[PDB]
Ligand binder design. Sequence first.
Ligand SMILES: [Zn+2]
Lengths: 94, 94
Amino acid sequence: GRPFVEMYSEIPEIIHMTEGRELVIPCRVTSPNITVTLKKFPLDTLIPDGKRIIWDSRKGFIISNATYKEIGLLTCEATVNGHLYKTNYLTHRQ
Amino acid sequence: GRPFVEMYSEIPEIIHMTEGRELVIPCRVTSPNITVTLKKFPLDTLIPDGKRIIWDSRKGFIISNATYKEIGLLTCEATVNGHLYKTNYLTHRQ
Ligand SMILES: [Zn+2]
């Protein structure tokens, strides 16, 4: 199946970030009932709290105030129908 | 071993390219005797001719006049001591 509207599982998509600025990780999904986990390689899981990090199923994750900690390989993961899907983004600066 | 001074085998390094401008794929090597192949995913092999594409072991591949065909995942491959090494670059625009 396809939980992510745009899926970059093999080669990451590049997105530009600016520190102090909003960073959208744009892994929007095909249904609002899909649960998505955001990860930063290799160790971190970023939990949305509805403020500093907001999940919107039509957009992806919205990180209000990006920092240098958000520079790297970021992965959205969703498990649907018992299967795990990943889509990958490489963030670096403007 | 390590034929490439900087080696990006697992997560590609990002490099900015501008069309009509020089593009360096910077997979410099640890010895001028190392043979390196340049590839563009998934089908292409780019052959240096000493003019449009120049190999310099201290720099990498120098593509005089980059085009949109050079946008994508580019890989330098070297076989040393019977082992194949790869280093990966994602090119996209300035
Ligand atoms: Zn960039």
